Design a protein around this ligand. Structure first.
Ligand SMILES: Cc1ncc(COP(=O)(O)O)c(C/N=C2\CONC2=O)c1O
Ligand SMILES: Cc1ncc(COP(=O)(O)O)c(C/N=C2\CONC2=O)c1O
Lengths: 398, 386
């Protein structure tokens, strides 16, 4: 059955020390690069609310699938054979979004950023340009950089944390610049928008009219407030084979470390390129984990989302009371809160909050453009941890 | 340990079982083992699952480095610097990336042949042309043609040599003298060398491994790749070591490399270094006994085949030229043996060049499986021969 009867405990404090977790160990390198961080007090017991992995356990249904695979004793060369994996994945997309795609069109990457890097290389020639809306998940730009593809930004319009696409701006840029590709988060990181069919259709008709490819990164699509629906870009715009879809269970099931992602490529030419040029076999533990999420993970994921919704409600009340000049809207999707602290801001905000709050967040410097004065707070943590972090953030701003 | 155990590989999406009607029944083909990954490794992965979260991971601090370098020191007297250790998702992914950084459009790569095929495919993926130096064959004992290598390096724009130490498919464990001589050629011509040492811990009693960078310590363009994937039967975990001693290339890697690591892959690999030596020694003893049977079997039952016990690997390289000519076999020997023996092997076609007439037999299998496979191979060859 679907996992609805089990009581889960999202309040559980799970120790992440001595696990080589980037969340615990690697904030200085990620946030500050090669810069000197000697001014940071090494012995600060930091509350982690930065990188997008969860402090909630990967559900036992997923972990038990990995255990059963280990019991088969050999961890040799693996690939996705037959149709069982495909059937599990398309069953999920059909059921949840009315989205179907052919088995031939499904290929695999070792995480979605690796997929983006490879895709951009195949799609874009040296003098082609890519468009992103801003603020943006940073690896969308890094994937272009890695391929020597220049990026153009279209800043989203912001009303008090409710963001929308400036279609006039996108259209102008697509028409006047050599834009070959748009990389797009549906739903959006860091703003949390769940795009409507109408928004996606409007963007799709700009892309079709201008022969622009669009990669829809839907990795956050199953993390959303109760009652929200997700519409895949390729469902909203079903008449264009240059929409590529990326989805995984990494975010939803807290298995980013397993590096196994779905890429749906509807363009026969690009698919041939992928098929003949893509190198890599698959990790058996990663594939069994992901398949287990699709087949068995429904109940747990619902419970996780319900708990997150209560965390967002607490956060909203907390900000209203304790930081009334901050601006926040509960996002429609993701476990990431985007908070405008422009009023309180008088060095990078990530450095500020580590030094002055003992809290690790992400700031404007992590989101490319159009992010001034904001932080991103990861609240996929026990409510008690979130409370402690919010208290420290508040103390530092006042 | 019970290396005789028959482990079911069906319903595990294993290439070895599902893929052979695609890469081109008793399975003796692709290089993973039918021996279980050792419990000391599996139990490390189980312990890591008990920590509940499988999030973003990298190699932090020095415990991994300490484990790996203690292994290389103990076993080969080889040490290297922590700063020079980076990671790839398997060695072929690492080769593809390294070739891209090292070589430009009109640089060529050199490989000795016969070769592991992905050495050439790593060059093809980077649009780098490959040049072949055929090894010299003395009745299944292979040697480098130093005259040929010297010529090719001097008279063509060879930027990189990709080298297997020990060698696949011939099994050669190169001597200090061989490595020193080859290294000096490369040093004098300013040629990068990638020494792929993935088979280095699978070797006969009485054979000792010398890393290329140990034999040739004063040339910083020797790159070493090592893994526990072959030795511990964990190729599915896709996690590999690369030792880059050249500061410019290391800077390029650190700036341009993308990827995090799989926590289950890292724990597994670290466990093999920290706890694996006893199982590995036992496995090697059992493999040696498989080779002794194979050598006896071929001498008695297929006397026209040419075969030498390989110094390393679990892979037997067998010249069947005599039989192919006498029978006028006009299909690949992998098709021949699937159809006529019900045995899957790798034919000459998988090994780039200088391979015609040979097959490669994987004998990292229970001894009774190997015996059954060798019986069927022999029967298909001697049918209607005197
Ligand atoms: C839009 C988007 N695409 C792709 C990825 C990568 O997912 P993977 O396949 O690597 O699991 C992320 C991860 N979000 C990152 C992780 O750290 N903070 C973030 O926002 C993301 O937000
Ligand atoms: C010399 C050499 N290098 C690298 C690899 C790749 O190892 P990975 O990092 O992927 O574990 C192999 C695997 N040998 C292959 C595997 O199948 N048949 C063969 O000959 C090999 O022989």
């Amino acid at each position: 059955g679907g996992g609805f009867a089990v009581n889960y405990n999202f309040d559980e404090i799970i120790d992440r020390r001595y696990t080589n977790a980037m969340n615990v160990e690697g904030y200085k390198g990620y946030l500050f690069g090669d810069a000197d961080t000697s001014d940071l007090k090494d012995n600060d017991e930091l509350i982690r609310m930065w990188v997008a992995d969860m402090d909630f356990g990967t559900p036992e249904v997923v972990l038990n699938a990995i255990r059963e695979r280990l019991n088969k004793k050999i961890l040799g060369y693996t690939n996705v054979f037959g149709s069982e994996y495909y059937e599990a994945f398309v069953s999920w997309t059909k059921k949840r979004y009315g989205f179907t795609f052919s088995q031939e069109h499904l290929v695999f990457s070792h995480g979605i950023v690796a997929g983006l890097i490879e895709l951009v290389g195949y799609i874009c020639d040296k003098d082609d340009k890519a468009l992103i809306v801003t603020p943006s998940y940073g690896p969308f730009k890094m994937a272009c950089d890695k391929n020597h593809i220049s990026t153009v930004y279209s800043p989203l319009i912001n009303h008090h944390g409710y963001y929308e696409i400036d279609f006039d701006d996108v259209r102008k840029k697509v028409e006047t610049e050599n834009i070959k590709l748009c990389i797009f988060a549906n739903p959006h990181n860091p703003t949390g928008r769940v795009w409507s069919e109408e928004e996606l259709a409007t963007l799709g008709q700009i892309m079709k009219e201008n022969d622009v490819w669009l990669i829809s990164d839907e990795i956050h699509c199953d993390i959303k407030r109760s009652g929200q629906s997700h519409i895949p870009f390729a469902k909203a715009v079903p008449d264009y084979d240059k929409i590529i879809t990326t989805m995984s269970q990494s975010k939803a099931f807290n298995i980013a470390g397993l590096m196994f992602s779905n890429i749906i490529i509807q363009n026969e030419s690009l698919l041939k390129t992928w098929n003949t040029h893509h190198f890599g076999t698959e990790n058996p533990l990663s594939v069994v984990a992901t398949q287990a999420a699709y087949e068995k993970g429904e109940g747990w994921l619902q419970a996780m989302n319900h708990y997150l919704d209560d965390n967002f409600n607490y956060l909203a009340d907390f900000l209203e009371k304790e930081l009334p000049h901050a601006e926040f809207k509960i996002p429609e999707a993701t476990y990431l809160a985007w908070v405008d602290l422009s009023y309180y801001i008088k060095e990078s905000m990530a450095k500020f909050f580590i030094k002055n709050a003992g809290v690790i967040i992400e700031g404007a410097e992590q989101f490319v453009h159009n992010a001034e004065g904001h932080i991103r707070i990861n609240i996929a943590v026990p409510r008690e941890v979130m409370k402690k972090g919010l208290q420290k953030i508040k103390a530092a701003l006042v």
